[PDB]
Amino acid sequence: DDVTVVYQNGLPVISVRLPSRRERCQFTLKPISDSVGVFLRQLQEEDRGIDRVAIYSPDGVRVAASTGIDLLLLDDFKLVINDLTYHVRPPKRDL
């Protein structure tokens, strides 16, 4: 339960723990414009020691980058930071 998904002002907020400092860093994104590559590119740009960054679907399949993040916020998934295979369940939305 080390990574959150809690909405504020109609948009997702993803507070995750970084590898360098343990202070939780939240990530505000847009379901419309922001994509998975904006999120992971961001994450790489808040820790210089993040080596391989990934996101997988429940069935292990790597989710693409140009996929909209609104489409990622329909089901649960896995955010992978280094050896950390993270599991995330996002609250219910419509679209």
Swiss-Prot record:
Outcome (variant: residue 51 to R): No effect on calcium uptake in presence of high concentrations of calcium. Abolished dimerization of MCU
Region N-terminal MCU domain, residue ranges: 3-93
Modified residues (S-glutathionyl cysteine): 25
Location within or outside the cell: Mitochondrion inner membrane
Induction annotation: MCU transcripts are down-regulated by microRNA miR-25. Down-regulation by miR-25 may protect cardiomyocytes against oxidative damage in cardiomyocytes.
Residues bearing PTM Phosphoserine: 20
Post-translational modification (record): Phosphorylation by CaMK2 in heart leads to increased MCU current. The regulation of MCU by CaMK2 is however subject to discussion: another group was unable to reproduce these results. Phosphorylated on tyrosines by PTK2B/PYK2, promoting oligomerization.
Record annotation: effect of changing residue 20 to A: Impairs calcium uptake, but has no effect on oligomerization and interaction with MICU1 and MICU2
Subunit structure, interactors included: Homotetramer. Component of the uniplex complex, composed of MCU, EMRE/SMDT1, MICU1 and MICU2 (or MICU3) in a 4:4:1:1 stoichiometry. Interacts with CCDC109B/MCUB; this inhibits channel activity. Interacts with MCUR1. Interactions with MICU1 and MCUR1 are mutually exclusive. Interacts with SLC25A23.
Function noted in UniProt: Channel-forming and calcium-conducting subunit of the mitochondrial inner membrane calcium uniporter complex (uniplex), which mediates calcium uptake into the mitochondrial matrix. MCU channel activity is regulated by the calcium-sensor subunits of the uniplex MICU1 and MICU2 (or MICU3). Mitochondrial calcium homeostasis plays key roles in cellular physiology and regulates ATP production, cytoplasmic calcium signals and activation of cell death pathways. Involved in buffering the amplitude of systolic calcium rises in cardiomyocytes.
Protein family according to the UniProt entry: Belongs to the MCU (TC 1.A.77) family.
Domain notes: The selectivity filter, in which calcium ions are arranged in single file, is composed of two acidic rings separated by one helical turn along the central axis of the channel pore. The N-terminal MCU domain is required for efficient Ca(2+) uptake and for interaction with MCUR1. It is not required for targeting to the mitochondria, oligomerization, interaction with MICU1 and MICU2, or assembly of the uniplex complex.
Protein name listed in UniProt: Calcium uniporter protein, mitochondrial
Gene transcribed to yield this protein: MCU
Parent sequence residues shown: 73 to 167 of 351
